Amino acid sequence: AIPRERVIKAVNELIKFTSKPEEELKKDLQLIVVNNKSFTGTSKSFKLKLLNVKHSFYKPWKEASATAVKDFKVLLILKDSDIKKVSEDDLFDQLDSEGIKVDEIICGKDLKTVYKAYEARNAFISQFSLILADDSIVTSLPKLMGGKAYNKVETTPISIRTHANKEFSLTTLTNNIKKVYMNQLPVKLPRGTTLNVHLGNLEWLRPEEFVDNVELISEQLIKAYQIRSIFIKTNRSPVLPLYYNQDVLDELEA
Amino acid sequence: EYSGIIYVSRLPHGFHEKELSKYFAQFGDLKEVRLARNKKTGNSRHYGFLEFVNKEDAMIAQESMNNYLLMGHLLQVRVLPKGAKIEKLYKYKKRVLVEKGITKPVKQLKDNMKQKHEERIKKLAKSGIEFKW
Amino acid sequence: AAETFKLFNKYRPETAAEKKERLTKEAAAVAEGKSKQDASPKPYAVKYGLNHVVALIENKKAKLVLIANDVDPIELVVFLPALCKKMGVPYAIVKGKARLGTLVNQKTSAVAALTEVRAEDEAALAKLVSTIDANFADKYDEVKKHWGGGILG
Amino acid sequence: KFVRAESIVAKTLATSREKERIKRVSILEDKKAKNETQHIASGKDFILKITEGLIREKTTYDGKPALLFIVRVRGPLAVNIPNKAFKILSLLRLVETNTGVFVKLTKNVYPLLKVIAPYVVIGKPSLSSIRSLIQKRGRIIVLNDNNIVEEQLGDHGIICVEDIIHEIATMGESFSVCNFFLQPFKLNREVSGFGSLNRLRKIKQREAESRTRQFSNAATAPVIEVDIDSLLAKLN
Amino acid sequence: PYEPLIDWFTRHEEVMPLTAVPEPKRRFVPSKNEAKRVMKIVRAIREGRIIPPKKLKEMKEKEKIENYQYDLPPTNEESYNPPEEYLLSPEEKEAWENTEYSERERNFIPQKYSALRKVPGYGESIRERFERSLDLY
RNA sequence: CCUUCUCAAACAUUCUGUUUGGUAGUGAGUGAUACUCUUUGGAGUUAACUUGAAAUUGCUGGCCUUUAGGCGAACAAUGUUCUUAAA
């Protein structure tokens, strides 16, 4: 495992670094970096791995984005048939039970005709943060979203499932949106030895809660991949050791 | 006065020199054709250069093409002055990855990381806020 | 002109026949006991009546106007180019009133104005506007600016 | 002729499309044949069946030698054929459109179906359809060729062409024999084409086909199948 | 003489429209007159003067069926089954070939019947029926 | 003037739940913190911002095969050749 005291120490002292008087918003945001051997799948991997996390920073994202200029907005991407059967109120009544909200639902037809225009498409995606798409549609997205959508973490889509049986039930979508929203966080899978994972502004969560999220994510990743080390920081601050496995280097050579 | 060398901007997606040659030959035999090209991945910079055998034919092609609506956007072609020459273009391909062997044996970079981690601990006392590990 | 007409053919106006089919459909929909009541969005179509076309000018609302060249009372149309020039509407002189009639469920129209366009064509509309500004306003303004004809036949 | 600057863009992008999809199919079928399923879409294949929005039912493929009759449908709007599909079609003699042929369906034949899926249509024929096809259509190589193979066919043991129907339906003894014996096949065009009344039918079957034929471009595309009893009722 | 026309006033561009007409209400609400026409059709169908289009198609589908429902010797001279007479057929075959076509068709009706297995396949029959149709016409 | 992979399995019965796999980009520019290795040649990654599908020359990676193709498939592999969308 990883010594939690070290991570608590790091988060408190990064709070200290930030307390010293877009970039000004930027210099408070938490970024894990993970060095690991041959993180490639030998191939590009736009698929986002959804790691189980104890706490949900999207609700703090709501509470701070209400004040922020950019408003948090949710995009769901469903088939023509699903949008035909699914209505906005049916989703809204389910989401007010836990107190969240989808901002819009969109079709692939809609993407390929309404937003087949680079400026309009870019503005439409950049407005939003959470991009959800049916796992069936997810395999067809890349030529539609545009590469600029896939460069950034928020703009790239998240895999979500509507079907559980042969046909899809609203219960599956209802609880899968909850699973993706308040129990899962995105993880891009680029090439090279370097991974980056987003947590968010320090001001949103408890630093001890930050630590619990960081350690849960790190041990999940260690169980997943052979990690050279775990380098957490803020994207303005210098770099910080917490943990490292040295034998991974030997395996990297061999 | 102008030359036979020609500049065309705003080229469609997928519209390569093989397509350019097959039309601008129809106006007349051309000495040269090139398109401006990116290195890492085979995608367009949407502009290219032509060169015709006869300047007068080059004038005609420019005249009928200066505002050529095509594939949902307009093309703009302009004749070069007499003092103009073709330079430094090449058909770049998609540059694929490499995996080169790690030269130092295991136990050497074993030492480097312990140095680097311990070193990467030291900038933190230098940055720097009280750290043990 | 070809792409202008391809753009317009998506925005054909509803025929009298199609209008009556939808009317009887919805009236039958009201027929049921157990009827159905719904609210529907705005229609989208070109606009074509001469005084109506000038009406959408002086607002302004015409994002595009096409003017046929062959009109036996040409004085019906001589002002439209200068009017849209001074107003900045992106006018274009199309050639043939009959073809305007074809795209509008009429014999002839002599004018074709469009104001409201869906998001799925808005970028196409803007780029075509820049195109016509490049092909017509730039090319022919200096030869709009001379006396024509005068050569014997 | 001055051809155009526009159709070239359509055919170039459509070739990039056909090339990427056939490449994906080659990856998937090579990995499946070599039994190296580590990171792929699906491990087994599927067959789609459209019948009378219209009901579309899907099944898992059976490694069973099944009789089919291929019908070649006009290719996509602006595509020049890639050479791989060209070779497959030439082997199956599906050039000269409105051309079909009977085929055995086994696992070795099966991967090529995705290769030529955007240029053909599949389905399950009935003996009534097959009988109408042969007794109303079918010719054999010119002059003595037609006679001499009938002798070789007799050496195999076939006579009275109705027995060719029986063996094509049965597949008991030798299908490739009869398959090579029926080397050319031809069907009329369902619409006479040019004319005031006819153009309506052209547009209507264009819409109907656009409803029916589906271009997955997934490489896990379920095999689209149609009721050939209706297709030949139209085309024969 | 002639001179080009000066464009001294067109070059000035007004940034506003000529007239400040207040926008009417009806441009933003669904049109009332189509609703009135709809309700006219509604009262008509309620009285039954107009049949619904679905019921009309049902009536047509039934009525098509209902309308289409209610209403109120040379062969032995010819051989055709292992018989002998057609042994005259190959003897003067060149001779009948040498006659005119309008003689040939009747003269090439007769051909040797080998056995049940083979039937040559009716090269002549369609032409004979077409000629008979013309003879009627 | 074309249209974008719009689902697979296994377990389980909870009136649908759990797990696993499936996604090559629109080009150009700004740019933080940096990460590893390469053996100095730099290479693959990293915050996130701009843009009317915008527009000017960033010189020639490497391996393999054949006479262009794979490195996201090795005895792996690809070319532009469908006519009742004509005349």
Q: What value, to the nearest 5°, has the Cα angle with vertex E115 and ends E109 and E116?
A: 95
* Number of structural domains found in chain D: 1
Sort residue B91 into left (φ over 0), alpha (ψ -120 to 50) or beta: beta
Half-sphere exposure (CA, 13 Å, Cβ side) for D26?
8
Burial (CB count <10 Å: 0-12, 13-18, 19+), residue D178: buried
Which nucleotide's C1' sits nearest to the alpha carbon of D72? F82
**3-class SS of residue A233:** strand
Helix/strand/coil (H/E/C) assignment for every residue in chain D: CCCCCCHHHHHHHHHHHHHHHHHHHHHHHHHHHCCCCCCCCCCCCEEEEECCCCCEEEEECCCCCEEEEEEECCCCCCCCCCHHHHHHHHHHCCCCCCCEEEEEECCCCCHHHHHHHHHEEEECCCHHHHHHHHHHCCCCCCCHHHHHHHHHHHHHCCCCCHHHHHHHHHCCCCHHHHHHHCCCCCCCCCCCCCCHHHHHHHHHHHHHHHHHCCCCCCCCCCEEEECHHHHHHHHC
Instruction: Determine the distance in angstroms separating the CA of E62 from the nearest CA of chain C, rounded to an integer.
Output: 21
Query: Distance between CA D85 and CA D72 in Å, rounded?
Result: 12
Q: Which residue, chain included where needed, has tokens 């309506």?
A: D200
Q: Nearest-CA neighbor of A63 among A160, A206, A203, A251?
A: A203
Q: Which residue, chain included where needed, has tokens 């093989």?
A: B18
Judge contact between B26 and B64, C-beta under 8 A. Answer: no
What are the structural domains, with CATH classification, of chain C?
1-153 (3.30.1330.30)
**3-class SS of residue A160:** strand
Residues D9-31 as b/e (b if ≥16 CB within 10 A, e otherwise) read bbbbbbbebbeebbebbeebbee
**3-class SS of residue E122:** coil
Q: Which residue, chain included where needed, has tokens 């969005």?
A: C41
Residue numbers after which chain A breaks, C to N beyond 2.5 angstroms: 21
Which tokens hold the place of D50?
Answer: 């459209």
Element (H, E) at C112: strand C111-114
Sort residue A188 into left (φ over 0), alpha (ψ -120 to 50) or beta: beta
Query: Distance between CA E80 and CA E58 in Å, rounded?
Result: 54
Which tokens hold the place of A9?
Answer: 């120490």
Residues C54-66 as b/e (b if ≥16 CB within 10 A, e otherwise) read bebbeeeebbbbb
Q: How far is CA A34 from the centre of its chain?
A: 16
Which tokens hold the place of E8?
Answer: 């001294």
Query: Distance between CA A211 and CA A55 in Å, rounded?
Result: 11
Q: Nearest-CA neighbor of A101 among A92, A89, A110?
A: A92
Judge contact between A110 and A168, C-beta under 8 A. Answer: no
Which tokens hold the place of D146?
Answer: 């037609």
Integer angstrom CA distances of residue C136 from C131, C142, C143, D47: 8, 11, 11, 55
Judge contact between E53 and C24, C-beta under 8 A. Answer: yes
Cite the DSSP H helix spans in C57-113.
Answer: 79-87, 97-102
Q: Which residue is nearest to nucleotide F25 (CA to C1')?
A: A147
Q: In the beta sheet, which residues pair with residue C67?
A: C93, C111
A242 with B133: Cβ contact below 8 A: yes
Exp. method: cryo-EM
Q: Nearest-CA neighbor of A53 among A32, A74, A83?
A: A32
Q: In the beta sheet, which residues pair with residue B5?
A: B51
Q: What is the DSSP letter of A189?
A: B
Q: How far is CA D103 from the centre of its chain?
A: 9
Integer angstrom CA distances of residue E110 from A31, D3, E9, E122, E133: 98, 59, 98, 12, 22
Length reported for chain A: 254
3-state helix, strand, coil split of chain C in percent (to 5) is: 45, 10, 45
Which tokens hold the place of E126?
Answer: 């369609």
Does B109 contact A at CB distance below 8 Å?
yes
E17 with C86: Cβ contact below 8 A: no
Query: Distance between CA A117 and CA C33 in Å, rounded?
Result: 46
Handedness of CA D58, D63, D69, D70 (dihedral sign): positive
Length reported for chain C: 153
Query: Distance between CA C68 and CA C71 in Å, rounded?
Result: 7
Integer angstrom CA distances of residue A136 from A11, A163, A235, D88: 40, 10, 35, 30
In sequence order, what are the residues at sequence separation of 6 or more whose Cβ sits closer than 8 angstroms to the Cβ of residue C6?
A: none
Query: Distance between CA E21 and CA C7 in Å, rounded?
Result: 31
Judge contact between D231 and D73, C-beta under 8 A. Answer: no
Q: What is the DSSP letter of C137?
A: I
Judge contact between A105 and A83, C-beta under 8 A. Answer: yes
Query: Distance between CA E26 and CA C94 in Å, rounded?
Result: 32
Integer angstrom CA distances of residue D45 from C97, D38, D154, D214, D223: 57, 16, 39, 16, 8
Query: Distance between CA A142 and CA A149 in Å, rounded?
Result: 9
**First-to-last CA distance in chain D?**
39
AA letter at B1: E
Q: Nearest-CA neighbor of A75 among A113, A46, A110, A36?
A: A110
Q: What is the DSSP letter of E111?
A: -
Q: Nearest-CA neighbor of A254 among A226, A220, A214, A221?
A: A226
Element (H, E) at A217: helix A207-224
Query: Distance between CA D119 and CA D114 in Å, rounded?
Result: 10
Instruction: Determine the distance in angstroms separating the CA of A87 from the nearest CA of chain C, rounded to an integer.
Output: 15
- Of the candidates B13, B14, B71, the beta carbon closest to that of D6 is on B71
**What's the Å distance between residue A252 CA and nucleotide F71 C1'?**
21
Bridge pairing between strands D66-72 and D100-105 = antiparallel
C122 contacts in A (CB within 8 Å)?
117, 120
Query: Distance between CA B69 and CA C92 in Å, rounded?
Result: 15
Query: Distance between CA A166 and CA A141 in Å, rounded?
Result: 22
Q: Nearest-CA neighbor of C89 among E35, D59, E14?
A: E14
**3-class SS of residue A62:** helix
Judge contact between B78 and B3, C-beta under 8 A. Answer: no
Query: Distance between CA C104 and CA C14 in Å, rounded?
Result: 9
AA letter at D88: I
**What's the Å distance between residue D82 CA and nucleotide F79 C1'?**
8
Domain that holds residue E116: 73-137
Q: Nearest-CA neighbor of A201 among A35, A3, A64?
A: A64
Integer angstrom CA distances of residue A150 from A113, A144, B95, B116, D113: 20, 11, 20, 33, 33
AA letter at E18: L
Element (H, E) at C65: strand C64-67
**Closest-approach residue (CA) in chain C for B73:** C127
Judge contact between B120 and A241, C-beta under 8 A. Answer: yes
Query: Distance between CA D223 and CA D52 in Å, rounded?
Result: 18
Handedness of CA B28, B33, B35, B41 (dihedral sign): positive
Report, in angstroms and rounded to the nearest whole number, the Rg of chain A calculated over CA atoms.
19
Q: Which residue, chain included where needed, has tokens 């062959």?
A: C70
Query: Distance between CA A123 and CA A117 in Å, rounded?
Result: 10
Burial (CB count <10 Å: 0-12, 13-18, 19+), residue E122: exposed
Which tokens hold the place of A109?
Answer: 């037809």
**3-class SS of residue B8:** strand
Q: Which nucleotides of F are covered by protein (CB under 7 A)?
A: 1-9, 15-18, 21-28, 32-39, 43-62, 68, 70-73, 76-86
Judge contact between C110 and C68, C-beta under 8 A. Answer: yes
Judge contact between A187 and A197, C-beta under 8 A. Answer: yes
Q: Is the CB of D215 under 7 A from strand F?
A: yes
Which nucleotide's C1' sits nearest to the alpha carbon of D119? F82
Domain that holds residue D127: 1-236
Output the DSSP codes for A96-110: HHHT----EEEEHHH
- Of the candidates E13, E18, E45, the beta carbon closest to that of C58 is on E18
Query: Distance between CA C64 and CA C54 in Å, rounded?
Result: 12
Query: Distance between CA B106 and CA D14 in Å, rounded?
Result: 50
Judge contact between E111 and E82, C-beta under 8 A. Answer: no
B73 contacts in C (CB within 8 Å)?
127, 131
Q: In the beta sheet, which residues pair with residue D72?
A: D120
Judge contact between B4 and B58, C-beta under 8 A. Answer: yes
Judge contact between A117 and A141, C-beta under 8 A. Answer: no
Does B83 contact A at CB distance below 8 Å?
no
Q: What value, to the nearest 5°, has the Cα angle with vertex C103 and ends C100 and C105?
A: 100
Integer angstrom CA distances of residue D95 from A27, D74, D78, E112: 65, 11, 17, 40
Q: Nearest-CA neighbor of E41 among C26, A171, C132, D182?
A: C26
**3-class SS of residue A234:** strand
Q: Collect contacts of A24-28 with beta carbons under 8 A, ≥24 apart.
A: A25/A68, A25/A201, A26/A235, A26/A236, A27/A234, A27/A235, A27/A236, A27/A237, A28/A201, A28/A202, A28/A203, A28/A234
Integer angstrom CA distances of residue D167 from A88, D89, D140, D236: 59, 24, 18, 22
Judge contact between D123 and D69, C-beta under 8 A. Answer: yes
Q: Collect contacts of A80-84 with beta carbons under 8 A, ≥24 apart.
A: A80/A107, A80/A108, A80/A109, A82/A134, A82/A162, A82/A168, A83/A107
Judge contact between C39 and E31, C-beta under 8 A. Answer: no
Query: Distance between CA D38 and CA E1 in Å, rounded?
Result: 89
Q: Nearest-CA neighbor of D230 among D83, D125, D79?
A: D125
Q: Nearest-CA neighbor of E54 among C32, C25, C33, D54?
A: C25
Query: Distance between CA A250 and CA C142 in Å, rounded?
Result: 76
Half-sphere exposure (CA, 13 Å, Cβ side) for B133?
15
Integer angstrom CA distances of residue A239 from A32, A34, A230, A236: 10, 12, 10, 9
Query: Distance between CA A17 and CA D137 in Å, rounded?
Result: 86
Q: Going along chain A, which residue ranges are E strands?
A: 29-36, 51-52, 74-78, 104-107, 130-134, 158-160, 184-185, 194-201, 227-234, 240-244
Question: Using N-to-C axis directions, what is the helix angle for B17-27 and B55-63, rounded to 10°?
Answer: 110
Element (H, E) at B37: strand B30-37
Residues C27-46 as b/e (b if ≥16 CB within 10 A, e otherwise) read bbebbeeeeeeeeeeeeeeb
Query: Distance between CA A22 and CA A18 in Å, rounded?
Result: 15
**3-class SS of residue C106:** coil
**3-class SS of residue A16:** helix
Instruction: Scan residues 49-68 of chain B and list those with Cβ within 7 Å of strand F.
Output: 49
Half-sphere exposure (CA, 13 Å, Cβ side) for E111?
13
AA letter at D30: D
Output the DSSP codes for B78-94: EEEESS----S------
